[PDB]
Short mmCIF file of C-alpha atoms and ligand atoms in Angstrom, two decimals:
data_model
loop_
_atom_site.label_atom_id
_atom_site.label_comp_id
_atom_site.label_asym_id
_atom_site.label_seq_id
_atom_site.Cartn_x
_atom_site.Cartn_y
_atom_site.Cartn_z
CA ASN A 2 -21.97 -203.45 -55.51
CA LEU A 3 -20.88 -200.11 -52.94
CA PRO A 4 -18.66 -198.60 -54.93
CA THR A 5 -15.45 -198.46 -53.02
CA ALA A 6 -13.53 -194.62 -53.08
CA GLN A 7 -11.54 -195.36 -56.28
CA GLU A 8 -14.50 -196.47 -57.53
CA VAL A 9 -16.65 -193.45 -57.14
CA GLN A 10 -13.80 -191.00 -58.49
CA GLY A 11 -14.64 -192.76 -61.55
CA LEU A 12 -18.75 -192.56 -61.31
CA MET A 13 -18.57 -189.26 -60.16
CA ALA A 14 -15.88 -187.64 -62.34
CA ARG A 15 -18.15 -189.51 -65.56
CA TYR A 16 -21.18 -188.04 -64.43
CA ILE A 17 -19.85 -184.55 -65.19
CA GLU A 18 -18.26 -186.28 -68.53
CA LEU A 19 -21.62 -187.18 -69.65
CA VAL A 20 -23.50 -183.97 -68.25
CA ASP A 21 -20.86 -182.22 -70.11
CA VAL A 22 -22.68 -183.65 -73.62
CA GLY A 23 -25.54 -183.54 -72.38
CA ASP A 24 -26.98 -187.91 -72.78
CA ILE A 25 -29.83 -187.53 -70.99
CA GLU A 26 -30.93 -191.20 -70.76
CA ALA A 27 -27.20 -192.18 -69.85
CA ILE A 28 -27.19 -189.59 -67.62
CA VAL A 29 -30.47 -191.02 -66.33
CA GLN A 30 -29.27 -194.00 -65.86
CA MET A 31 -26.57 -193.38 -63.24
CA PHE A 32 -29.72 -193.00 -60.81
CA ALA A 33 -31.42 -195.13 -58.49
CA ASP A 34 -34.92 -194.99 -59.82
CA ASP A 35 -36.04 -193.93 -56.62
CA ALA A 36 -33.67 -192.12 -56.14
CA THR A 37 -33.68 -188.05 -54.42
CA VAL A 38 -32.28 -185.20 -56.16
CA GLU A 39 -32.19 -181.52 -53.98
CA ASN A 40 -30.74 -178.90 -56.04
CA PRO A 41 -30.06 -176.60 -54.88
CA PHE A 42 -30.11 -178.27 -51.46
CA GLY A 43 -32.92 -176.13 -49.83
CA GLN A 44 -35.35 -176.60 -52.50
CA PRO A 45 -37.90 -179.70 -51.52
CA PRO A 46 -36.70 -182.73 -53.48
CA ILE A 47 -37.00 -184.47 -56.81
CA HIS A 48 -37.21 -187.66 -56.71
CA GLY A 49 -37.87 -190.63 -59.33
CA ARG A 50 -35.80 -190.86 -62.41
CA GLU A 51 -39.54 -189.67 -64.71
CA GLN A 52 -38.77 -186.46 -62.85
CA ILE A 53 -35.00 -186.57 -62.02
CA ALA A 54 -35.36 -186.99 -66.06
CA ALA A 55 -37.29 -184.06 -66.86
CA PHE A 56 -35.17 -181.78 -64.42
CA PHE A 57 -32.32 -182.59 -66.74
CA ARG A 58 -34.34 -182.06 -69.75
CA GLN A 59 -35.01 -178.43 -69.28
CA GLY A 60 -31.65 -177.90 -67.75
CA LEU A 61 -29.03 -179.10 -70.72
CA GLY A 62 -32.21 -179.26 -73.61
CA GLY A 63 -30.67 -175.93 -74.95
CA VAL A 66 -24.69 -176.35 -71.84
CA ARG A 67 -21.27 -176.77 -70.51
CA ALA A 68 -19.85 -178.84 -67.12
CA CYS A 69 -15.63 -178.73 -65.82
CA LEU A 70 -14.78 -180.47 -62.74
CA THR A 71 -12.37 -177.43 -60.66
CA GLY A 72 -10.72 -179.46 -58.53
CA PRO A 73 -10.28 -183.77 -57.54
CA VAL A 74 -13.38 -185.76 -56.70
CA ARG A 75 -12.34 -186.24 -52.22
CA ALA A 76 -14.27 -190.42 -52.11
CA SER A 77 -15.18 -191.40 -48.64
CA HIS A 78 -15.71 -195.93 -47.62
CA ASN A 79 -18.52 -195.55 -47.03
CA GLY A 80 -20.83 -195.24 -50.86
CA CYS A 81 -20.27 -191.26 -50.82
CA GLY A 82 -18.22 -188.60 -52.46
CA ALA A 83 -18.53 -184.86 -52.94
CA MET A 84 -16.51 -182.57 -56.12
CA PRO A 85 -16.30 -178.77 -57.26
CA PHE A 86 -17.44 -177.92 -60.58
CA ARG A 87 -18.70 -174.96 -62.60
CA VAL A 88 -21.35 -174.80 -65.13
CA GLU A 89 -21.38 -172.51 -67.86
CA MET A 90 -24.07 -171.71 -69.77
CA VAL A 91 -26.63 -168.57 -71.47
CA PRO A 96 -23.78 -166.66 -71.08
CA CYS A 97 -22.40 -167.03 -67.44
CA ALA A 98 -20.65 -168.94 -64.93
CA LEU A 99 -22.19 -170.42 -61.83
CA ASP A 100 -19.82 -172.16 -59.50
CA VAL A 101 -21.49 -176.71 -57.81
CA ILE A 102 -20.41 -177.99 -55.44
CA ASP A 103 -22.43 -181.56 -55.95
CA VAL A 104 -22.65 -184.25 -52.55
CA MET A 105 -23.10 -188.33 -53.60
CA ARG A 106 -24.83 -190.73 -51.61
CA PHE A 107 -24.77 -194.74 -54.01
CA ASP A 108 -26.00 -197.61 -54.11
CA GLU A 109 -25.15 -201.10 -53.70
CA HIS A 110 -25.42 -201.25 -57.68
CA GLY A 111 -23.12 -198.55 -58.26
CA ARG A 112 -25.99 -196.07 -58.62
CA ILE A 113 -26.85 -192.59 -57.24
CA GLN A 114 -29.27 -192.56 -54.40
CA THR A 115 -28.98 -188.90 -53.40
CA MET A 116 -27.59 -186.18 -55.10
CA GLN A 117 -27.83 -182.54 -53.54
CA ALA A 118 -25.90 -179.45 -55.26
CA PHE A 119 -24.73 -177.05 -52.72
CA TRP A 120 -24.65 -173.42 -55.37
CA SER A 121 -26.80 -170.01 -54.77
CA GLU A 122 -26.71 -167.22 -56.78
CA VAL A 123 -22.88 -165.39 -55.03
CA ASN A 124 -21.86 -168.58 -56.86
CA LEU A 125 -23.63 -166.67 -59.79
CA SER A 126 -21.36 -164.90 -62.31
CA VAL A 127 -23.12 -163.90 -65.92
CA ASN B 2 -29.25 -165.78 -36.84
CA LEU B 3 -29.49 -168.11 -39.38
CA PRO B 4 -26.96 -166.52 -41.29
CA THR B 5 -27.72 -166.27 -44.84
CA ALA B 6 -25.51 -167.41 -48.38
CA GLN B 7 -23.48 -164.01 -48.18
CA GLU B 8 -23.30 -164.51 -44.52
CA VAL B 9 -22.46 -168.41 -44.51
CA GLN B 10 -18.92 -166.77 -47.35
CA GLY B 11 -17.84 -165.61 -44.51
CA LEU B 12 -18.16 -167.93 -41.65
CA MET B 13 -17.39 -170.92 -43.32
CA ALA B 14 -13.45 -169.02 -45.36
CA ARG B 15 -13.17 -168.44 -41.33
CA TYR B 16 -13.00 -171.56 -39.89
CA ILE B 17 -10.67 -172.25 -42.63
CA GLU B 18 -8.24 -169.08 -42.06
CA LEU B 19 -8.37 -170.16 -38.24
CA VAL B 20 -7.37 -173.97 -39.31
CA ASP B 21 -4.73 -172.39 -41.26
CA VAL B 22 -2.93 -170.52 -37.70
CA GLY B 23 -4.36 -172.98 -35.60
CA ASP B 24 -6.42 -171.28 -32.86
CA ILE B 25 -7.96 -173.21 -31.38
CA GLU B 26 -10.49 -171.94 -28.91
CA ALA B 27 -10.81 -169.84 -31.72
CA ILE B 28 -11.87 -172.76 -33.97
CA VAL B 29 -13.85 -174.51 -30.75
CA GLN B 30 -15.53 -171.63 -30.41
CA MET B 31 -17.54 -171.80 -34.28
CA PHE B 32 -19.82 -174.79 -33.28
CA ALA B 33 -22.33 -175.11 -31.09
CA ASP B 34 -21.72 -176.81 -28.22
CA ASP B 35 -23.64 -179.81 -28.72
CA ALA B 36 -21.85 -180.08 -32.08
CA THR B 37 -21.58 -182.69 -34.38
CA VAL B 38 -17.91 -183.86 -36.54
CA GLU B 39 -17.55 -186.53 -38.67
CA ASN B 40 -13.87 -186.53 -40.41
CA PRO B 41 -13.68 -187.92 -42.38
CA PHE B 42 -16.75 -188.61 -43.72
CA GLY B 43 -17.99 -192.12 -42.56
CA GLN B 44 -16.33 -192.32 -39.40
CA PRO B 45 -18.39 -192.39 -36.54
CA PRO B 46 -18.84 -188.89 -35.21
CA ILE B 47 -17.11 -187.16 -32.16
CA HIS B 48 -19.50 -184.53 -30.24
CA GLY B 49 -19.81 -181.60 -28.29
CA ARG B 50 -16.90 -178.54 -27.75
CA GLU B 51 -14.56 -180.89 -25.49
CA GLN B 52 -14.25 -184.19 -27.82
CA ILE B 53 -14.12 -181.55 -30.86
CA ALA B 54 -11.79 -179.84 -29.09
CA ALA B 55 -9.36 -182.98 -28.83
CA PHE B 56 -10.00 -183.35 -32.35
CA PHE B 57 -8.31 -180.25 -32.99
CA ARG B 58 -5.24 -180.16 -30.14
CA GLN B 59 -4.12 -183.64 -32.30
CA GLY B 60 -4.69 -182.93 -35.45
CA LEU B 61 -3.42 -178.86 -35.63
CA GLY B 62 -0.66 -178.42 -33.02
CA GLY B 63 2.68 -179.99 -34.01
CA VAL B 66 0.01 -177.48 -40.45
CA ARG B 67 -1.61 -175.27 -43.15
CA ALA B 68 -5.02 -174.62 -44.79
CA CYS B 69 -6.41 -172.43 -47.81
CA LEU B 70 -9.82 -172.96 -49.73
CA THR B 71 -9.39 -173.95 -53.74
CA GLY B 72 -11.95 -172.62 -54.62
CA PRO B 73 -15.04 -170.37 -54.12
CA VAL B 74 -17.16 -171.65 -51.46
CA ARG B 75 -20.83 -173.07 -52.22
CA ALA B 76 -23.88 -171.26 -50.17
CA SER B 77 -27.28 -172.31 -49.32
CA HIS B 78 -30.07 -170.48 -48.41
CA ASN B 79 -31.12 -172.39 -45.22
CA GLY B 80 -27.81 -172.14 -43.38
CA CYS B 81 -25.26 -174.67 -45.01
CA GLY B 82 -22.59 -174.40 -47.66
CA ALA B 83 -19.62 -176.54 -48.89
CA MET B 84 -15.88 -175.94 -50.31
CA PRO B 85 -12.57 -177.32 -51.56
CA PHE B 86 -9.60 -176.91 -49.59
CA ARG B 87 -6.67 -178.37 -49.10
CA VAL B 88 -4.64 -179.11 -45.92
CA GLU B 89 -0.52 -178.97 -45.66
CA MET B 90 1.69 -180.41 -42.86
CA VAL B 91 4.34 -183.48 -42.01
CA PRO B 96 6.05 -183.83 -45.61
CA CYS B 97 1.97 -184.00 -47.68
CA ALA B 98 -1.27 -182.51 -48.49
CA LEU B 99 -5.03 -183.31 -48.77
CA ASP B 100 -7.31 -182.55 -50.87
CA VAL B 101 -10.94 -181.93 -48.71
CA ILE B 102 -14.72 -180.47 -49.37
CA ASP B 103 -16.10 -179.31 -45.13
CA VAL B 104 -19.97 -179.88 -45.82
CA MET B 105 -21.35 -177.59 -42.94
CA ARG B 106 -24.70 -176.90 -41.13
CA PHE B 107 -25.29 -174.06 -39.27
CA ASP B 108 -27.46 -173.77 -35.90
CA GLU B 109 -29.92 -170.16 -35.69
CA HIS B 110 -26.57 -168.59 -33.57
CA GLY B 111 -24.20 -168.75 -35.92
CA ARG B 112 -22.25 -171.37 -35.35
CA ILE B 113 -21.60 -174.84 -36.47
CA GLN B 114 -24.08 -177.52 -35.67
CA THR B 115 -23.22 -180.20 -37.64
CA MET B 116 -19.56 -180.23 -40.12
CA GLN B 117 -18.46 -183.36 -42.63
CA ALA B 118 -15.19 -183.13 -44.03
CA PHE B 119 -15.45 -185.88 -47.51
CA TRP B 120 -11.46 -187.36 -48.57
CA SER B 121 -9.78 -190.58 -48.53
CA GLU B 122 -6.35 -191.62 -49.42
CA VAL B 123 -6.86 -191.52 -52.96
CA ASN B 124 -7.13 -187.08 -52.16
CA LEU B 125 -3.80 -187.83 -50.01
CA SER B 126 -0.24 -186.65 -51.80
CA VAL B 127 3.43 -186.72 -50.30
C1 LIG C 201 -30.00 -176.26 -63.75
C2 LIG C 201 -28.78 -176.70 -64.31
C3 LIG C 201 -28.40 -176.69 -65.43
C4 LIG C 201 -27.48 -177.79 -64.63
C5 LIG C 201 -27.53 -177.82 -63.88
C6 LIG C 201 -27.32 -176.01 -62.75
C7 LIG C 201 -27.14 -176.75 -61.34
C8 LIG C 201 -26.34 -177.74 -61.17
C9 LIG C 201 -26.40 -178.78 -61.66
C10 LIG C 201 -25.96 -179.68 -60.64
C11 LIG C 201 -25.60 -180.64 -61.85
O1 LIG C 201 -25.36 -181.80 -61.15
C12 LIG C 201 -26.20 -181.13 -62.58
C13 LIG C 201 -26.54 -179.70 -63.35
C14 LIG C 201 -26.33 -179.31 -63.14
C15 LIG C 201 -27.67 -175.17 -63.74
C16 LIG C 201 -28.93 -174.67 -62.26
C17 LIG C 201 -28.96 -173.57 -64.03
C18 LIG C 201 -29.26 -174.72 -64.76
O2 LIG C 201 -30.20 -174.23 -65.68
C1 LIG C 202 -6.69 -184.62 -39.10
C2 LIG C 202 -6.38 -183.54 -40.08
C3 LIG C 202 -5.46 -182.08 -39.64
C4 LIG C 202 -6.16 -181.65 -39.57
C5 LIG C 202 -7.83 -182.09 -40.32
C6 LIG C 202 -7.51 -183.06 -42.04
C7 LIG C 202 -8.48 -183.95 -42.75
C8 LIG C 202 -9.13 -182.66 -42.42
C9 LIG C 202 -10.09 -181.65 -41.65
C10 LIG C 202 -10.89 -180.63 -42.32
C11 LIG C 202 -11.38 -180.25 -41.63
O1 LIG C 202 -12.35 -178.60 -41.58
C12 LIG C 202 -10.34 -179.17 -40.82
C13 LIG C 202 -8.80 -180.05 -40.47
C14 LIG C 202 -9.12 -181.22 -40.86
C15 LIG C 202 -6.62 -183.32 -40.96
C16 LIG C 202 -5.93 -184.76 -41.66
C17 LIG C 202 -5.19 -184.99 -40.73
C18 LIG C 202 -4.77 -183.95 -39.81
O2 LIG C 202 -4.06 -184.65 -39.66
#
């Protein structure tokens, strides 16, 4: 159903674990099939599991991700977290904001970051 | 005008400095006069500088606040940051998400946190 604050902490942490390994099918299944994803925030949103799968495929395919502090969760199915992505030879500080639906799936994801958060 | 990513880092950091000391008039002046503030996210929004000033007055009046990681800024006048608030004898992990207007003032502020983020 619509995830409690504590359940939101678990789901969002699970998302980060999945990104870290790069299990694309399992990542994609975390989203609603009509999920919208803004990454970075300000860019036009990509929509739906097909467009989202492609995003993660060229994102992660050829990469590491960890939380830098606790997940902050609300009581209306949303949450936000700080993490850092590492890659190739650099690093990127990120904050994701996620809203979950009544099935425990991600309906909306906005990622906040820009080049000032980037470090080679 | 509408603040660049770097300017957003400065503004949002300045907000945190102001909260730390508790300079209420200066905090309030950071907001647009018609700013909406959701704190915590999920609660109904308070609106306008009068309702916002009252919020900070009973919040900070009788308290310390610092960033726990870098501000994450976008290119469309928004940004997000992790910080921790301390008070009385406890501590609270928080993530604020802010949108700025074309005057460098805060038009919308949503704060993400709940009791799982609280620690006595
Ligand atoms: C897309 C990305 C890979 C993964 C990733 C990036 C940026 C923000 C993200 C936010 C997420 O919630 C999950 C993954 C990313 C990367 C930026 C550069 C890059 O290759
Ligand atoms: C309201 C509060 C004081 C300040 C503050 C709290 C919570 C979230 C905040 C978010 C902000 O961007 C600025 C200040 C607060 C506190 C929670 C409890 C409390 O007393």
